[model samples]
Target: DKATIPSESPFAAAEVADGAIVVDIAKMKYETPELHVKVGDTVTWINREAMPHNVHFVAGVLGEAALKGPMMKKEQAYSLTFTEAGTYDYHCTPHPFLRGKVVVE
Candidate 1:
């Protein structure tokens, strides 16, 4: 019955919904090298490989202070919420060849 259904239940749906955009890290590379997001949106990076990895932003792209992420192991994750609109170029700290960019509008 419609009245028997829970209205405010957290498990209303079979699966939960995640608001953040996800970038998967595997095989020493970012699954999506480029992404576009809106200001105030959150981006999450998940490490799928056993090797540790970190995200380091390019200097002067977001300002004087650089935005950096902590080293993440397999199954680990890091999240960043963009507060301003601009292009952010980032790379894996241990492997500079692995790069990505986020454009916020």
Candidate 2:
């Protein structure tokens, strides 16, 4: 689902501020399911709900680029920058079914 995210989302869950792309963890999922960015771009996941969530890129899956984030409380942010080029599929540790993707080109 990398970058095929068209302009017809009906609702937006992303933001850009200070050169950082922001994806919101609102409702029960990562609202910005498909994100496209340049290789050096930084994307920050923000927990907007009242519960907790974590971004987990499985170690073996992402190889040396694997990253696991801390449990994010309401209004917390987990920022990560992409250095490699590929489609990254991630899920919330607390809610594995919650998925999101990012493609760095």
Task: Please name the candidate that would achieve the greatest lDDT relative to the true structure.
Answer: 2
Per-prediction backbone clash count: 0, 0
Instruction: Assess candidate 1 and give its lDDT.
Output: 0.71
Error of 2 at 87 (Å): 0.6
lDDT of each: 0.71, 0.72
TM-scores of all predicted structures: 0.79, 0.77
Give the TM-score (vs. native) of candidate 1: 0.79
Residue lDDT tens for model 1, 1-105: 001111221111122237648888899889989999888776777788789887888567665666556787777777677778878889988799999998889
- TM for candidate 2 is 0.77
User: How would you encode candidate 2's per-residue C-alpha lDDT over 33-62 as one tens digit per residue?
Assistant: 999989777787778887888788876545
| Residue 31, candidate 1: C-alpha displacement in angstroms | 0.8
True-vs-predicted CA distance for residue 86, candidate 1, Å: 1.2
